[PDB]
Design a protein around this ligand. Structure first.
Ligand SMILES: [Mg+2]
Length: 94
DNA sequence: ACACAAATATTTGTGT
DNA sequence: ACACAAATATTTGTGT
């Protein structure tokens, strides 16, 4: 149906915070979004590219090696970018 | 969006 | 059958 009101940055931040170890792979981010938001079960090419692009562009998502590919985590300075927990409004940079 | 490299995964080929 | 190497395919990550 309609696309949810959350930005790609909010979606990634939801997935990272939802992981028990606060670290998650890229496919884990795909699965999180598709499980909770049916709009993203279609045309995966497009938005999954936008997910990868948002992971590399924004400093707030830092890549970390494992112990498949790599774990994505939140910079602690940006862990609560969405202060009220609704993920509708994002705090701006210090 | 695009192109593209780098890193992994899968399929195919060869020898025994 | 197996082990293993080559070659391809796919995913992951980065740069305008
Ligand atoms: Mg980044």
């Amino acid at each position: 149906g309609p696309k949810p009101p959350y930005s790609y940055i909010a979606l990634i931040t939801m997935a990272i915070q939802n992981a028990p170890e606060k670290k998650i792979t890229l496919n884990g981010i795909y699965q999180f979004i598709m499980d909770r938001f049916p709009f993203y079960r279609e045309n995966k090419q497009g938005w999954q590219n936008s997910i990868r692009h948002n992971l590399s562009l924004n400093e707030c998502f830092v890549k970390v090696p494992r112990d498949k590919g790599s774990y994505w985590t939140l910079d602690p300075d940006s862990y609560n970018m969405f202060e009220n927990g609704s993920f509708l409004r994002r705090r701006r940079r210090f």
